Design a protein around this nucleic acid. Structure first.
Ligand SMILES: [Mg+2]
Ligand SMILES: [Mg+2]
Ligand SMILES: [Mg+2]
Ligand SMILES: [Mg+2]
Ligand SMILES: [Mg+2]
Ligand SMILES: [Mg+2]
Ligand SMILES: [Mg+2]
Lengths: 144, 141, 142, 185, 75, 62, 118
RNA sequence: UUAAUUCCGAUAACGAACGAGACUCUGGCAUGCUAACUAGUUACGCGACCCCGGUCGGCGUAACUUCUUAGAGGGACAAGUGGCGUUCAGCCACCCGAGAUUGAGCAAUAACAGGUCUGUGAUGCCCUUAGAUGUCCGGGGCUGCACGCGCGCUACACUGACUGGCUCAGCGUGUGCCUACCCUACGCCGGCAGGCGCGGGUAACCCGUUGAACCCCAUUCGUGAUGGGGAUCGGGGAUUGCAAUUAUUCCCCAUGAACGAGGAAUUCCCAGUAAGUGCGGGUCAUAAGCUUGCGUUGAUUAAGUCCCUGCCCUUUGUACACA
């Protein structure tokens, strides 16, 4: 399969994001902000896809199989502790949160922390370190 | 003529996993395609059949040093925990994959539970590993 | 039948190796494994230096079973090689003619002196004020 | 063979030191034949004992540099082992001999010091030291941030120094060093 | 600033280049094969595997960091 | 201009600002009666052969 | 900048003559296989001799290009002379494999490079 | 002349005292001694596997102390040889050999407005002493953040990263007068941190043959801020704690910043040294980016000088003497 056949695509378009076709698929679908180096491997093992195959080398019949497992992992036997959003503060729903949904959920966590005037929300507003860090000496680029 | 000791262990593990494949009863778990087998890792084991090689390694280590339990296996399959911004340390393997390799390898009668605990190799398990040593020794000719 | 064992030790560092050389056939093996598979294998000919310098017919009448404890892989290999080269040495003082022993010394020492006498270099103690044995911490001014 | 000692797979004979200024400072021949470039050591106990050190032991000793590679003589023995096979394949001739030729061709014969500078000539020992050092860091900055291996860079750098091709860092720093020694004598 | 576009699979304009000249190289390594043919090192290793299986090149030594091949022995 | 070869017959002392050079008497290997003085950089013991790229440049004493 | 560009071009030429030496050596290799398996390939031995002519002159050209690069980094030989001979050396690299070959004998006699020993 | 106010020698000095040296510990060496069921080795018997032999930290007892332990001794003295030397004090090289310069500890006189009243029921004086500067409880701060500096850790990758396999240490510490808090084998549930059960160990006895990391062998990568790097940040899960929010710590997923080897300048170091690499101890309810030890792998260069910064001695000059 080292010959370049038909159906090679240099840039893929899943979850309204690009994919480098040069990469192995197990690191190529990490380009979706929401899917990382290891959630890529668990999705590409729940579907029978050989990991030495490249993103451009894949055909259309299996890229939809990849992103449907991305969209709903609990329907495809992925356990609950891979997910970046379980026990949500609004619907209590276990899900994996993806490309623009990740910015949406991060922003709603931020503003839901802002509205109650929590300390972490106020430090996120002012731009300081929110996890209790010593801001006296380091972090010289978030400030000035 | 040949033992497990007097043959190179590198291909010996790689061929004994194939013997455990040909047995066809090695009892892989349900999460074997999803997990990381140690704390000091960040990526899943790339081999689809890493459980068979791990069982081969465990059988070989039980041959070479018996009386070994789950804490001993996590001591054997330990590595450097890269703590990121902090320096690296020593971390162990996964107790569940260790105990399920042992429970599989006593599900098919190749290891045995020692009195008070620990795992020892059965005599026919020694025979199995020694014939796998014989096959990889005939592979040197 | 005279039992003709000799049991010697050899060192490089905290690793020490005991070679058990007795009357038999041409067997040489360390920790139960033969000498051609002891890790790391880039020092395979380092392990084989007593064998390849002294040939095989000197090894023909004796078998040697070596255990080694302590240290690490390179110090392990040097203690093993030490133990072999002085195991044939202490067998051939004891059981055969002394002049075969003398010409074996004429092979081993004039190749390398660390086959039969260990180097006395051991780890020097770390002292206070520094990260190690001789080095010290960074001195800061102003 | 009991008489001749192969350096793994290279004979230590058929290597002729074309210079006599480095003939008693390049240890290759007739008592210094060893199987490996890994010995125990005690070569820095006295002042001139590193002359007794065989030149491939010194080549592996000077190749373990830049901090992350300190204590890795087994790895540098393996790099030099692969580099010698690449050299023998590229030239059809003895890697030990073109290593000796690279030493002789790269060793800078005169230097400049401060007694505004003043020119001096070099020790045979310092000439061999500077030769090995320039060859090793020519391999190092050939292999840094690059796809090709340190074994390949050491191999082609030794071959380029054995011909004086001015593509080797050792030659193109030797000639400038002798040039600035020429400038202030 | 600087960037290389290394081929990740051979196209037909490079496959003939490989299978024509590369078995005639005195030094054959995936590194130098990448440097001549502007390909990746992984693609070069996958190339030299089938070239060794078809016997157009000859393995001399292998390591996990350095594998070297050459031309066919004459005989 | 031929380059010449010369054997050290004597080491005289360390010279330089930091004492980094040796000052040796060299006897040429063409004429065994021609011995001049050169300052030499590096560890030089007596009995050793040096390649002089300039050979008639005599070195100042100590 | 100009000296660096010219020396870089000389490095590319020693690379391409190394490659073409490898090509002619491998054709010598395979025709030598054929002659040793079946003696009687006199035409193949003659082709080996013609390829050996090509290898010999490519080696000579490598040695003079190496002399040029040495003397150029030592700043002794002038870049105007190297630009005087760059067109003819390019012509050699382009036309060495052709039967129609009109080579300059005076490539390095224009600079007295064969006159000066190594 | 020496590392030395170390000696020879000279001598208005003679005889001495401290420091130096000697000294104690530590390292290296003993197949000679003492001895070993809390250390073993070798034999022999039995068991297991293979094809008479091989392996076995599988089980057991007749010798022995090589390996181990730690005691008594021995050992090395510039002793031997050849030069250099007032043929002195001594220096260089070499033989023989484990060692021909192992590393520390202790460390004189005189001092310094050096630090410590926040080590003390060591302590003078002063302040305060019931609306307390005593003491206790609750909460907060010592972590606060435009900037500057110091000690450090991680890195900027292919001499690498990831993933499998293989294979080796040495110091230790461990169930507590108060005092609760130990080290853990092993069985089972759990991806994981963890949890639920029975056991050993007050320790050469159990953890433990401390299966440590680096290194070594095999995969995937491919010069791309990339699978380098892992900061920042979001969601969830466990442990300790009376209580964790300004996230105690640990995990899981996701986010994937600067950083392409660092200006002027500047630190430490020469043989098991630097450097890499992990493991102990202290701190510790939870606990190492620190420190103190330990090993493991193991060099480049140097056997020199007074150029720089300082130190010692003599002579010399001085308007300096809190110099
Ligand atoms: Mg004061
Ligand atoms: Mg504070
Ligand atoms: Mg990245
Ligand atoms: Mg990373
Ligand atoms: Mg300084
Ligand atoms: Mg502290
Ligand atoms: Mg005056």
């Amino acid at each position: 399969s080292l010959v370049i056949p038909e159906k090679f695509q240099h840039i893929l378009r899943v979850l309204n994001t690009n994919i480098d076709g040069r990469r192995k698929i197990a690191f190529a679908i990490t380009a979706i902000k929401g899917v990382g180096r290891r959630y890529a491997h668990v999705v590409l093992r729940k579907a029978d896809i050989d990991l030495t195959k490249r993103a451009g080398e894949l055909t259309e019949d299996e890229v939809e199989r990849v992103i449907t497992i991305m969209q709903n992992p609990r329907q495809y036997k992925i356990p609950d502790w891979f997910l970046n959003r379980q026990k949500d503060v609004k619907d209590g729903k276990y899900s994996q949160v993806l490309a623009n949904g990740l910015d949406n959920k991060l922003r709603e966590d931020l503003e839901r922390l802002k509205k109650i005037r929590a300390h972490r929300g106020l430090r996120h507003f002012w731009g300081l370190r929110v996890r209790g860090q010593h801001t006296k000496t380091t972090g010289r680029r978030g400030r000035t | 003529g040949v033992t497990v000791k007097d043959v190179n262990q590198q291909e010996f593990v790689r061929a004994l996993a194939a013997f455990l494949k040909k047995s066809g009863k090695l009892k892989v778990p349900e999460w074997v395609d999803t997990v990381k087998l140690a704390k000091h890792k960040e990526l899943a084991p790339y081999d689809e059949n890493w459980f068979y090689t791990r069982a081969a390694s465990t059988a070989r280590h039980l041959y070479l040093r018996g009386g070994a339990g789950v804490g001993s296996m996590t001591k054997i399959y330990g590595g450097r925990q890269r703590n990121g911004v902090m320096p690296s340390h020593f971390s162990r393997g996964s107790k569940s994959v260790a105990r399920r390799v042992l429970q599989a390898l006593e599900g098919l009668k190749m290891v045995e539970k020692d009195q008070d605990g620990g795992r020892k190799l059965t005599p026919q398990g020694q025979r199995d590993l020694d014939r796998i040593a014989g096959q990889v020794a005939a592979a040197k000719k | 039948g005279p039992l003709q064992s000799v049991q010697v030790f050899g060192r490089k560092k905290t690793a020490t190796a005991v070679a058990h050389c007795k009357r038999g056939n041409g067997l040489i093996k360390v920790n139960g494994r033969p000498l051609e598979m002891i890790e790391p294998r880039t020092l395979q000919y380092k392990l084989l230096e007593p064998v390849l310098l002294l040939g095989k017919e000197r090894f023909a009448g004796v078998d040697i079973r070596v255990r080694v404890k302590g240290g690490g892989h390179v110090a392990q290999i040097y203690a093993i090689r030490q133990s072999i080269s002085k195991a044939l040495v202490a067998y051939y003082q004891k059981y055969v003619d002394e002049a075969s022993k003398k010409e074996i010394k004429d092979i081993l020492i004039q190749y390398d002196r660390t086959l039969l006498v260990a180097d006395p270099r051991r780890c020097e103690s770390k002292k206070f004020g520094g990260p190690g044995a001789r080095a010290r911490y960074q001195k800061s001014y102003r | 063979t009991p008489d001749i000692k192969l350096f793994g797979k290279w004979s230590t004979d058929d290597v002729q030191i074309n210079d006599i200024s480095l003939q008693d400072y390049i240890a290759v021949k007739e008592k210094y034949a060893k199987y490996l470039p890994h010995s125990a050591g005690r070569y820095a106990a006295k002042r001139f004992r590193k002359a007794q050190c065989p030149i491939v032991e010194r080549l592996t000793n000077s190749m373990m540099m830049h901090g992350r590679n300190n204590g890795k003589k087994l790895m540098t023995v393996r790099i030099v082992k692969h580099a010698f096979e690449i050299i023998h394949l590229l030239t059809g001739e003895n890697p030990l001999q073109v290593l000796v030729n690279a030493i002789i061709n790269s060793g800078p014969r005169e230097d400049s010091t401060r007694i505004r500078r003043q020119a001096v000539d070099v020790s045979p020992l310092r000439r061999v030291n500077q030769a090995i050092w320039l060859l090793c860091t020519g391999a190092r900055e050939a292999a840094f941030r690059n796809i090709k291996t340190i074994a390949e860079c050491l191999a082609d750098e030794l071959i380029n120094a054995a011909k004086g091709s001015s593509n080797s860092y050792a030659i193109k720093k030797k000639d400038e060093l002798e040039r600035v020694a020429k400038s202030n004598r | 600033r600087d960037k290389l576009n290394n081929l990740v699979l051979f196209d037909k304009a490079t496959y003939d280049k490989l299978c024509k000249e590369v078995p005639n190289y005195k030094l054959i390594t995936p590194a130098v094969v990448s440097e001549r043919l502007k390909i990746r090192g992984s693609l070069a290793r996958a190339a030299l595997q089938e070239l060794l299986s078809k016997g157009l090149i000859k393995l001399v030594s292998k390591h996990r960091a350095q594998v070297i091949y050459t031309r066919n022995t004459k005989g | 201009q031929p380059i010449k070869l010369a054997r050290v017959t004597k080491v005289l002392g360390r010279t330089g600002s930091q004492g980094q050079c040796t000052q040796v008497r060299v006897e040429f290997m063409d004429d065994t009666s021609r011995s001049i003085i050169r300052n030499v950089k590096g560890p030089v013991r007596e009995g050793d052969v040096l390649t002089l790229l300039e050979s008639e440049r005599e070195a100042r004493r100590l | 900048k100009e000296k660096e560009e010219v020396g870089q071009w000389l490095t590319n030429t020693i690379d391409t003559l190394n490659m073409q030496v490898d090509q002619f050596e491998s054709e010598v290799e395979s025709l030598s296989v054929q002659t040793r398996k079946k003696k009687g390939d006199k035409d193949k031995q003659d082709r080996i001799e013609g390829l050996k002519r090509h290898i010999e002159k490519h080696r000579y050209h490598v040695r003079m290009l190496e002399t040029i690069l040495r003397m150029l980094d030592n700043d002794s030989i002038l870049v105007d002379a190297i630009r005087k001979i760059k067109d003819d050396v390019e012509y050699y690299v382009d036309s060495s494999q052709d039967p129609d070959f009109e080579e300059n004998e005076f490539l390095y006699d224009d600079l007295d490079l064969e006159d000066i020993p190594q």
